[PDB]
Symmetry: D3
């Protein structure tokens, strides 16, 4: 049976709009109301599902395969309105919380990074202050404002302010490019957030960074949020705010292997904007990233 | 609830892999093993479903809307192998026949036009020799050959040879471009098939051609097969064998309105090849064509 | 001096962010917060300006050329936020009103059609109830709702409700496809709006429709709003909600010639979404449409 | 044998870099040194050859097929430098003249329209003042200037000035858009050139225009020059200077049928710029146009 | 003479459909009947030839240039049917064997990787059991099946089973992603095939892997088969089954330098699918890879 | 205020066609008359400006931000004719010299690399023989010829011949691929130019190469010329002559940091050809490169 046949689900997992009893639920968040530049992330879930036919759960020289170790399912998407930022975030929180009431954790395949604040609220409600591993070209700890409380640059600002995240246990890797202001990282650092710029990542290497993550996160429940623009635009051209000089696909995938040494309670892959993608390579990468996280979840439990 | 949200089905119809009791079942045939030039029609069903979110059943100044008049469903796709032409055609016939055992008719959204021979066999088995309305830039009545019994240029040749079609009640509109040989249409015409070239269509007009169809088809059970390349490449660039100087989108959609004055027992929309499409306009058109046929089915019954 | 050289302005007109004393000001509205399906119209103004280098004011066998008859300028764009629908509409109204305080009229090159409610408010404030010529594939007279008061399907609903438009003097041409509900046009018609579907347009022809417009509009001050999706997706693939079976580019351009026989007090060209465009043909067409309106403005005065 | 197999030649004709004894030689002119806006026409010959696999010489209900009536061949390309306008034009003239020394006529598949002056010089040298049928969205009778003697807007200006063309026997169809100056057509008309704008073409129709051509050309040796941008950008997006509101593909192809009633001594299809093409539909159309001209040549002799 | 001028051949080499006496013949295999996901590799030969204009034989600081050291030619393509897998493979074998009867070796630029079994049969027939250097993201040693004996995942399975390859002298580099089953590599390894995953390649480095190849291949006649998907999708997006986290272009090109220390008797570059390519960079890379192999052939002899 | 709003200028800097008193003026050179293969670089300035909205002057953990340290402005473009190579180069020289008469230095965002000879003449006229840091995949020190005195392969040949450059103080990094002749680098090396091939760059590393630059350039006034094709086609597909196996985006950006330790008197970023770009990633990279140079200029002064 061809992998491009049949209605597309993430990695061809079974479909269940009202999942109950699974370890990890894959949930789509087709929304880009938080994008400040290029929109289009609302089609991310659809594109990612479409290309995921090429990725299975069986790695290489790994065990029996992710899906034989844990029970996963594709719960469809959250009905997020494209007309009201505040309403969409609340709907997201509500939906994500609902999932956690009957399932261990979820993997959000979405639109812009702003939606992560909803995930953090839902996950923190069930585990308490969370440790965070954030892969992004941008810090996403910028101030909100009137008529723009949830732009995709505020997710982790809210997380820290709302005590959803324990800054002393948060590490963001890949920061590069330009800050909106010269003292934009003072906030995150002042709160104890460990910032690893793309430059330092190059000095530390994958192993070095992996050790740093393990040391800063420990065994606290951790949320892994991945902004697709963390990798260089060459590997992920389909995104809203590309930033030249990013990580290689293999570097990111290799790094994520350390997640298996932690206690992940949730993750997401955001900012995929299909329209700007070339040959669907961004969606395919996004899929591979999701697959690696799902497998690491299994290894960790 | 946004139309781009949730797993995509044709026109967002309910999904049921084993449909029973419906008037018309939408079935995908993701296969391009019959394409002689550009492949890719295997992704047609997926692309068409994806863009169909923009098309509803409620026309304009029409009745209550197609889906309140008849019961339709998206039965997913036929598992067609991309490795063996003969096996795929048989699988298609078997699957399509299965659908007719518990449902009135089907609408095949597929890959290349070769698959239509399987539909004709399935439909003819339940209604006897069929009347045919074929929209295509090519006659598709060419000879088969060893190692290529079912290339997309043979569907209606088999239909006539196998007595699945009553040539005296077959009309193909839109023929233009180039025949493989100077006497290529002698076969169809010798059998009594009415050929209306794109040129003559221009002289007859939509109404004139509609009258011709009604007169040649009468009230016999009719199968309506539409090759997307019937319209000019400008309106449908996403197809395997484009042919300049074709019909306008509106001309084809207007023409299909006459189907409501007949007794349709099945139809298909083939040759959509997404990779060559621009802005998804081909898939969107293909969707609109399917919607018009579904509505005409309702009007006819 | 090459037309692709120098910072791009609409039709290479002079730039003046705070214009005063001109006949017609070209103003960009880079916003798509009202789009219900495909976003991207926020880049419309930029793309349209970019490709406008190919279009001059000198027609063919026309007079001395549009720009020697009237004084026009490119006023840049309105700073429209992508984070709040209500705030963007108010900012648009305010900015457009500002322009009318020192200039005769404006030509809004924008994002989604929802922004037209802001233009109608600004224009109506200076001329009173307006006559309207609306070219669109959709009526855009649908009900608003909580958390979505200004989706691009509500502009003319608000116009009528707010008494900004005199329905008895409004004509919309090109309607086709699907209404959200079977009784969706009852509203517009009940108010006396003349609806000319793409089908009727075909029967009436350009001349017939032009006479109808002149008769229904008279000499009342008229606002001409053009949704790029009025033309078939083949001619304008770069738009948010394509609708197959639309008008030909030449048909729309020819029709707009009748504007010179009226008293235009404003116009706009909306819904151009560059990302879905092919070869920039949509932006080029949008430019030509704007040029024709500017010229007709001159002819009318 | 698949049509996409083997090194590509125009319509899969035999290849012969030094042809002798043929009726019509297909020659490529990969050059865009004359383009004033979008470059890229230098790849036109290559793209056109590539897609020509879909077009044969056997029409529909026509005779035995073009290639059984006349002997044609693909002579490869003229080595045209992209660094010097004047040198390229001379090289073109020299090469084209060489072809005519041993073959009846040629079909130039090229780059920008400026190259036609070289063809006119070569053909006029063997037949004397020529009658001309020019299909273009622009008159191409603009003044040359220092450092730009051969921009693609000067071909027919030179033709008339150099007495290569008999203006009283020249007809250009499709003119639309914008003239560089309000009295830009005075030159052509003053010389007796019959200008049929896209607008008038609509009034005259294909038949009416065909009669006009026959009447104005008579039996004088005629050169048929076709600028691909004569058709609307929707049908030919792959060109340097698109002009909205153009002819339909079928209109142009139908019109060219009248060439068979004349005495054609040469023709060309110019301005195809592949990079801006969508789905290769422009190259495919260009191919079909060349095929129709080749067939009409045969019919005329 | 511009490199984009004249009918395109691989690296602008002379053309000869029936070559005799050359060292290396470049032969195209326009076929994708073995692709299991995205088709399109049938256009690989054409696209690769088209872009090869940018690559010459003269390296940098290398000797006199590849083409002055050995005699190469472009033999056109093998007429491979797109309708029957088994017939195409036999035709390929027959054609490739024919070439070896009068020429030293060949470089197959093709479609999907399944075609390599035909090359292995032809080469093994003249040299006996072969040593193999296989660059691919997938092992291609999967089981065949009824109605799919030659899908692109079976080439090296057949090679070993048919004794065309000496597994103890086979090395495949770049394996990554997902195996169809958790014990999928047991077969290759059980036969003594050295598998170097993309991960291990990173540890070994180019030099380390080069030493490993030299040691495992020795001086036995070796066939070098390169699947374009061995490099990360960012460098080669135009392929049927992309696999994130692949090698860098420079890594692969640098690695291939070790071929000059072996005794190459044949090579191929497969899976290039132009439709999914961006800016032709995949075809350009494929060309550069072919050039490096040709040069290494010369160095080795 | 959205960054995609308002007429686009490089990095949203103020616009001033006749700048006076600034430290660095950003000037566009929309010209590709020197391209030998793919044209299109004439749209480079426009595309780069368009995407530059994403890049600010405020780096990360850097000082107050580039634009608070120095005064920069976007001077628009040089009116370069696309019809005459020699005239365009002279116009460029004249315009660039004019800028230097009232501003410290300029950053040329242009078309093909041939234009750099004009910049070198203008800069050398005010500083004397210049030291040069050239990043390119090609040496660009090839011989000129009649009818092609300024093809993009001659810039640095002229620079040395005309004594505008002090070869003993010139370093070009990234050379790879193919030389037109086996002894093509003898010229540059014979003059004392330090050539660092992409291969050697890999051995030296960023730091090693940075030291080499500092040592070979010293404190002499230096011109930094960057050909976008220096990075692998994966990172910069939008260019005229791609060369596989190039540098990573981060490698080039990191390397340019050493410019701050020198005395830069001018720089340029050339060969960006938008049409071949994917997701605008080439233009975005080009922007980032320009930003880094501007910042390093500030650091150096
Ligand atoms: Mn983010
Ligand atoms: Mn980010
Ligand atoms: Mn067909
Ligand atoms: Mn067809
Ligand atoms: Mn609208
Ligand atoms: Mn609309
Ligand atoms: Mn022309
Ligand atoms: Mn023209
Ligand atoms: Mn393979
Ligand atoms: Mn592979
Ligand atoms: Mn260069
Ligand atoms: Mn270069």
């Amino acid at each position: 049976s061809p992998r491009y046949a049949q209605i597309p689900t993430f990695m061809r997992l079974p479909h269940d709009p009202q999942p109950r009893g699974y370890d990890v639920v894959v949930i789509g968040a087709p929304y880009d109301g938080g994008t400040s530049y290029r929109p289009g992330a609302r089609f991310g879930p659809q594109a990612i599902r479409s290309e995921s036919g090429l990725i299975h759960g069986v790695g290489i020289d790994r065990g029996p395969g992710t899906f034989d170790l844990i029970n996963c399912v594709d719960a469809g998407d959250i009905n997020l309105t494209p007309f009201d930022m505040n309403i969409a975030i609340d709907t997201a929180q509500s939906h994500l919380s609902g999932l956690l009431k009957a399932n261990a954790a979820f993997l959000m395949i979405g639109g812009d990074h702003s939606l992560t604040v909803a995930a953090l609220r839902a996950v923190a409600e069930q585990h308490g202050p969370l440790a965070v591993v954030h892969l992004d070209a941008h810090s996403d700890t910028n101030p909100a404002f009137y008529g723009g409380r949830y732009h995709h640059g505020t997710p982790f600002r809210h997380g820290i302010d709302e005590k959803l995240i324990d800054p002393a246990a948060m590490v963001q890797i890949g920061i590069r490019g330009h800050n909106p202001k010269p003292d934009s990282l003072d906030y995150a650092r002042g709160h104890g957030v460990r910032v690893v710029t793309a430059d330092e990542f190059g000095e530390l290497g994958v192993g070095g960074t992996a050790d740093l993550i393990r040391e800063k996160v420990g065994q606290r429940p951790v949320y892994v949020s991945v902004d697709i623009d963390v990798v260089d635009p060459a590997f992920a051209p389909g995104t809203g705010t590309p930033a030249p000089g990013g990580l290689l696909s293999r570097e990111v995938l290799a790094l994520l292997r350390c997640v298996g040494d932690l206690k992940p309670v949730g993750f997401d892959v955001m900012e995929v904007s299909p329209l700007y993608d070339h040959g669907g390579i961004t969606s395919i990468l996004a899929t591979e990233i999701g697959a690696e996280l799902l497998y690491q979840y299994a290894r960790a439990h």
